[PDB]
């Protein structure tokens, strides 16, 4: 029964490495999502300062 | 030491080796980033001696030896007067005086072994007599540091 | 020797390797969220300095 | 349970798992180096091997600095007493074991260098203090200031001082002296010269094999310098005493830790090779499995490491058939060549208790291998006394004792020859073959020759004779079909030689014919080479039996000649001449008899060689030699 579970453990190690590769891919995509979600914040402070400059 | 020994025996995960290698550079450069004269003057002025990564190097005492010499070696006479004054008031076989006696014996051994002109300050001040008696007491690591400090001044006497 | 001990040992080893793989897998996004928030705060301060 | 890992090729994993199962093991499952996250090809195993090499170099430097010998033994199991103390049952830590040895060696090197420098400085100042104090006298007259110049120095020979005084007196005028002082080894010299020629005297004194300077000690800033030299020599003795006590306490406190650290570094270095982190180990042992073993069964499983399996902590035949009949056939046939066997049993039994002390004595190369095989020399030495006591039946003349001892080795070797064929026929269990034809022609010829030798000793009345018997009947037989027996054979009536020749001639086709029937449920050349090799070995195996009776009769004649030639001369000339001549003749006779018995015991390896090659060829290698000593041990 070792010859049937040996390939299941060998594929289970590759799936376990693939899960960490998927988590590293999501962690790598989280920086691009943070930069894309952070690059738009300058327009609200620029328009908020322009509203305070237009009010003055 | 755990980061340096753990840096050689890395794991399968790259995040552990990148975290240990990233923390080892900031931990090693954190103590090396400070000045030896401000650390030695702050530790000697604060009256608290302790070991560090840059305190066991002979280059710090050799670099601060010329800057410390301003009153005929008054800085080394103040450190030897702090070690001998700690030896008289607050006698050995104590927890507090053992660290300052060991660090003052290592720094006095490195400063005495660095230049041969600091031996006159120890004989003029009077801390050279307590260095020979401090070796025969307990704390044999501090007795080995005082044995190296007495061997450094004893090496310049006879060649 | 027997196949039941190898089947139980491989069955425990596969579940332990899978649970260790997922439990070691969650920390990448668990630190990546705080890293993305720190990068967004740094970019927001970098834009707010020139805006001010 | 204790996690164990083994590495070997993927060809004998079924045979390697049987030894671990018989020695204690459960949950044997085959795996690879790409399943778990703790066994794969990584550089961490090479870095741990480099850290184990640096820890081995630090342990070698600490062992060399400790003044102790290098530790060894290969202690890896926990069943023994010293293996449990020299090997921890917990996990392996390379950094914690490396830092505890590097931290001790880093202080031990500075303590040894400071102790050697303080001892050299204290020996120099103490050596120069007595020279300065002795030279100052020849009361303060020369060490406190004067108008004359003195030259003090130590020298190991007065001839160099006489030649330097003759050269200085001949080449520089009367500017020398003549002084001699005994010292502790060197001699104190006393030279005097002018105060304006001290620079020229340094080159001639240094070039004359001497160190005659103005001042021996390096303390001359006051009057006198011996007071400061007595203080420096009074503090250097205390600093050298404290450094010697701290160095002795450090080496005595670190010697056992380094000795256990070497044994832990052996298994820690073996764990890196068991991890398979190198590309060369992947193309050598492709099979790597794991199993569960208990703590109590880990000692018995770690005692025997199988044939090629690597039993990790916390010629591979085991049962048959390599050395089964060699344990009885080896010492019994080897002891027949050697009562003379009492000295071999006493010398063999004397090394039992003294094996540990005799292991480190370093005396001889054959005595060490005899001390390792104590059970073989004890069994063969004990069995040699029985057959040796019978020869040295009786023997009083020539051609009387050799007629029975010559025919005794044929019947003695025939039982081992039939036992080797029965042991070879028992193995491999149509499903059997290649052994029914063997021992049929030699069993008939040698069976009728042994039967004629057995019936020859009963031939009384006259229908008997001793020409020789044995070889004479077999030599006369097989050359005459019409005859019956010549001589001393069973006369019933003539058909014994016809049945023996028919059974020996019928074994020719049955040998090669029985190979394909026994092989099944390139064989031609193997059957022809096995037929010619069996035909040559059948005559060579029976022909090689003469060395036991030859060496036995030669040793018995060589012992009885000296004993019969010394016993009569020992008892003659009564008085002091009988005690002195009997003591010297008995001492020289026993001294030559011990060397003759050691020469026969050293020359008795023909049964081990012929039993190792010829007996091992038809039975199945060096597995029977280790299997014979391992049989009596277990």
From Swiss-Prot, chain A:
It is found in: Vacuole membrane. The modification N-acetylserine is found at residue 1. Present with 2280 molecules/cell in log phase SD medium. Subunit of the V1 complex of vacuolar(H+)-ATPase (V-ATPase), a multisubunit enzyme composed of a peripheral complex (V1) that hydrolyzes ATP and a membrane integral complex (V0) that translocates protons. V-ATPase is responsible for acidifying and maintaining the pH of intracellular compartments. Belongs to the V-ATPase G subunit family. V-ATPase is a heteromultimeric enzyme composed of a peripheral catalytic V1 complex (components A to H) attached to an integral membrane V0 proton pore complex (components: a, c, c', c'', d, e, f and VOA1). This is V-type proton ATPase subunit G. It comes from Saccharomyces cerevisiae (strain ATCC 204508 / S288c). The lineage of its organism: Eukaryota, Fungi, Dikarya, Ascomycota, Saccharomycotina. The chain holds residues 2 to 57 of 114 of the full protein.
Curated annotation (Swiss-Prot), chain B:
Disruption phenotype: Increases the ATPase activity of membrane-detached V-ATPase V1. Abolishes growth at pH 7.5 and in the presence of calcium chloride, abrogates growth at pH 5.0. It is found in: Vacuole membrane. Present with 22500 molecules/cell in log phase SD medium. Subunit of the V1 complex of vacuolar(H+)-ATPase (V-ATPase), a multisubunit enzyme composed of a peripheral complex (V1) that hydrolyzes ATP and a membrane integral complex (V0) that translocates protons. V-ATPase is responsible for acidifying and maintaining the pH of intracellular compartments. This subunit is essential for activity, but not assembly, of the enzyme complex. This subunit is also required for silencing the ATPase activity of V-ATPase when V1 is detached from V0. Belongs to the V-ATPase H subunit family. V-ATPase is a heteromultimeric enzyme composed of a peripheral catalytic V1 complex (components A to H) attached to an integral membrane V0 proton pore complex (components: a, c, c', c'', d, e, f and VOA1). Interacts with YND1. This is V-type proton ATPase subunit H. It comes from Saccharomyces cerevisiae (strain ATCC 204508 / S288c). The chain holds residues 320 to 478 of 478 of the full protein.
From Swiss-Prot, chain C:
It is found in: Vacuole membrane. Residues 8-38 form a coiled coil. Residues 1-13 are annotated as: Interaction with VMA5. It comes from the Eukaryota. Residues 12-31 are annotated as: Interaction with VMA10. Present with 16134 molecules/cell in log phase SD medium. Subunit of the V1 complex of vacuolar(H+)-ATPase (V-ATPase), a multisubunit enzyme composed of a peripheral complex (V1) that hydrolyzes ATP and a membrane integral complex (V0) that translocates protons. V-ATPase is responsible for acidifying and maintaining the pH of intracellular compartments. Belongs to the V-ATPase E subunit family. Homodimer. V-ATPase is a heteromultimeric enzyme composed of a peripheral catalytic V1 complex (components A to H) attached to an integral membrane V0 proton pore complex (components: a, c, c', c'', d, e, f and VOA1). Interacts with VMA5; the interaction is direct. Interacts with VMA10; the interaction is direct. Interacts with RAV1 and RAV2 components of the RAVE complex, which are essential for the stability and assembly of V-ATPase. This is V-type proton ATPase subunit E. It comes from Saccharomyces cerevisiae (strain ATCC 204508 / S288c). The gene is VMA4. The chain holds residues 8 to 59 of 233 of the full protein.
Swiss-Prot record, chain D:
Glycosylated. It is found in: Vacuole membrane. Residues 1-319, 355-368, 424-435 are cytoplasmic. Changing residue 547 to L: Reduces subunit stability. Changing residue 615 to D: Reduces ATPase activity. It is a multi-pass membrane protein. Changing residue 592 to S: Reduces assembly of V-ATPase complexes. Residues 104-132 form a coiled coil. Keywords: Acetylation, Coiled coil, Glycoprotein, Hydrogen ion transport, Ion transport, Membrane, Transmembrane, Transmembrane helix, Transport, Vacuole. Changing residue 601 to A/D/H/Q: Abolishes ATPase activity and proton transport, but does not affect complex assembly. Signal peptide: none annotated. The chain crosses the membrane at residues 320-338, 339-354, 369-392, 404-423, 436-456, 500-519, 532-556, 578-616. Pfam families: V_ATPase_I. Residues 457-499, 557-577 are vacuolar. GO terms for cellular component: fungal-type vacuole; fungal-type vacuole membrane; membrane raft; vacuolar proton-transporting V-type ATPase complex; vacuolar proton-transporting V-type ATPase, V0 domain. One of its GO terms (biological process) is vacuolar acidification. Changing residue 407 to A: Reduces assembly of V-ATPase complexes. Changing residue 497 to L: Reduces subunit stability. InterPro entries: V-ATPase_116kDa_su, V-type_ATPase_116kDa_su_euka. One of its GO terms (molecular function) is proton-transporting ATPase activity, rotational mechanism. It comes from the Eukaryota. Belongs to the V-ATPase 116 kDa subunit family. V-ATPase is a heteromultimeric enzyme composed of a peripheral catalytic V1 complex (components A to H) attached to an integral membrane V0 proton pore complex (components: a, c, c', c'', d, e, f and VOA1). Present with 55714 molecules/cell in log phase SD medium. This is V-type proton ATPase subunit a, vacuolar isoform.
């Amino acid at each position: 029964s070792q010859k049937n579970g040996i390939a299941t453990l060998l594929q289970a190690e590759k799936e376990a490495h693939e899960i960490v590769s998927k988590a590293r891919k999501y962690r790598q995509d989280k920086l691009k999502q943070a930069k894309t979600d952070a690059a738009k914040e300058i327009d609200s402070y620029k328009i908020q300062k322009d509203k305070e400059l237009k009010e003055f | 030491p755990t980061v340096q020994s753990l840096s050689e025996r890395k794991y399968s995960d790259e995040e552990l080796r990148q975290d240990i290698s990233n923390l080892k550079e900031i931990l090693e450069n954190e103590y090396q980033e400070l000045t030896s004269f401000d650390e030695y003057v702050a530790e000697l002025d604060s009256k608290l001696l302790c070991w560090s990564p840059p305190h066991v190097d002979n280059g710090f005492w050799s670099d601060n030896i010329d800057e410390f010499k301003k009153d005929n070696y008054k800085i080394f006479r103040q450190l030897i007067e702090l070690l001998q004054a700690k030896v008289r008031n607050g006698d050995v076989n104590a927890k507090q005086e053992k660290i300052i006696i060991q660090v003052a014996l290592n720094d006095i051994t490195h400063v005495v072994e660095l230049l041969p002109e600091s031996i006159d300050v120890l004989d003029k001040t009077g801390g050279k007599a307590d260095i020979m008696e401090l070796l025969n007491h307990s704390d044999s690591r501090v007795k080995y540091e005082a044995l190296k400090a007495t061997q450094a001044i004893i090496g310049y006497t006879f060649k | 020797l027997t196949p039941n001990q190898v089947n139980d040992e491989l069955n425990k080893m596969q579940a332990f390797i899978r649970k260790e793989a997922e439990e070691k897998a969650k920390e990448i996004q668990l630190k990546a969220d705080q890293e993305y928030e720190i990068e967004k705060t740094n970019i927001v301060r970098n834009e707010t300095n020139n805006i001010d | 349970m204790a996690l164990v890992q083994f590495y070997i090729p993927q060809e004998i994993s079924r045979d390697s798992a049987y030894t671990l199962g018989q020695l204690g093991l459960v949950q044997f499952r085959d795996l690879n180096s790409k399943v778990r996250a703790f066994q794969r090809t990584f550089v961490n195993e090479i870095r741990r091997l480099d850290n184990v090499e640096r820890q081995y170099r630090y342990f070698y430097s600490l062992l060399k600095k400790h003044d102790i010998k290098l530790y060894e033994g290969d202690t890896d199991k926990y069943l023994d007493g010293s293996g449990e103390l020299y090997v921890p049952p917990s996990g392996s830590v390379i950094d914690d074991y490396v830092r505890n040895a590097s931290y001790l060696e880093e202080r031990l090197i500075q303590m040894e260098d400071a102790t050697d420098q303080i001892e050299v400085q204290k020996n120099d100042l103490e050596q120069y203090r007595f020279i300065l104090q002795s030279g100052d006298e020849f009361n303060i007259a020369a060490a406190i200031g004067a108008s004359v110049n003195y030259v003090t120095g130590v020298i190991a020979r007065d001839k160099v001082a006489t030649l330097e005084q003759i050269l200085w007196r001949v080449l520089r005028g009367n500017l020398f002296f003549k002084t001699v002082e005994i010292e502790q080894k060197n001699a104190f010299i006393v030279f005097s010269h002018g105060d304006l020629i001290i620079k020229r005297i340094r080159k001639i004194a240094e070039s004359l094999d001497a160190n005659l300077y103005d001042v021996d000690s390096s303390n001359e800033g006051r009057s006198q310098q011996l007071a400061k030299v007595n203080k420096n020599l009074s503090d250097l003795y205390t600093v050298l005493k404290t450094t010697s006590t701290t160095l002795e306490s450090e080496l005595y406190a670190i010697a056992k830790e380094l000795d256990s650290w070497f044994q832990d570094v052996t298994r820690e270095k073996a764990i890196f090779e068991i991890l398979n982190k190198s590309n060369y180990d992947t193309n050598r042992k492709i099979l790597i499995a794991e199993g569960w073993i208990p703590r109590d069964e880990l000692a018995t499983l770690q005692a025997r490491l199988g044939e090629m399996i690597a039993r990790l902590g916390i010629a591979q035949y085991r049962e048959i058939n390599a050395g089964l009949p060699t344990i009885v056939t080896f010492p019994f046939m080897f002891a027949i060549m050697f009562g003379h066997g009492f000295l071999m049993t006493l010398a063999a039994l004397s090394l039992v208790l003294n094996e540990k002390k005799i292991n480190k004595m370093k005396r001889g190369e054959i005595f060490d291998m005899a001390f390792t095989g104590r059970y073989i020399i004890l069994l063969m030495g004990v069995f040699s006394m029985y057959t040796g006591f019978l020869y040295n039946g009786t023997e009083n003349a020539l051609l009387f004792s050799n007629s029975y001892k010559m025919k005794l080795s044929i019947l003695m070797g025939f039982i081992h020859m039939t036992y080797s064929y029965f042991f070879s026929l028992a193995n491999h269990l149509d499903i059997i073959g290649n052994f029914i034809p063997g021992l049929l022609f030699m069993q008939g010829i040698f069976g009728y020759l042994s039967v004629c030798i057995v019936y020859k000793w009963a031939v009384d009345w006259v229908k008997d004779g001793k020409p020789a018997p044995g070889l004479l009947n077999m030599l006369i037989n097989m050359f005459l079909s019409p005859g019956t027996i010549d001589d001393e054979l069973y006369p019933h009536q003539a058909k014994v030689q016809v049945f023996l020749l028919l059974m020996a001639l019928v074994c020719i086709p049955w040998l090669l014919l029985v190979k394909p029937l026994h092989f099944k449920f390139d064989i031609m050349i193997h059957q022809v080479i096995h037929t010619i090799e069996f035909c040559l070995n059948c005559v060579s195996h029976t022909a090689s039996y003469l060395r036991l009776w030859a060496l036995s009769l030669a040793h018995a004649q060589l012992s009885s000649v000296l004993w019969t030639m010394t016993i009569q001369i020992a008892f003659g000339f009564r008085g002091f001449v009988g005690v002195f001549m009997t003591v010297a003749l008995f001492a020289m006779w026993f001294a030559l008899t011990c060397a003759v018995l050691v020469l026969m015991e050293g020359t008795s390896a023909m049964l081990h060689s012929l039993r190792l090659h010829w007996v091992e060829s038809m039975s199945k290698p060096y597995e029977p030699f280790a299997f014979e000593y391992k049989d009596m041990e277990v």
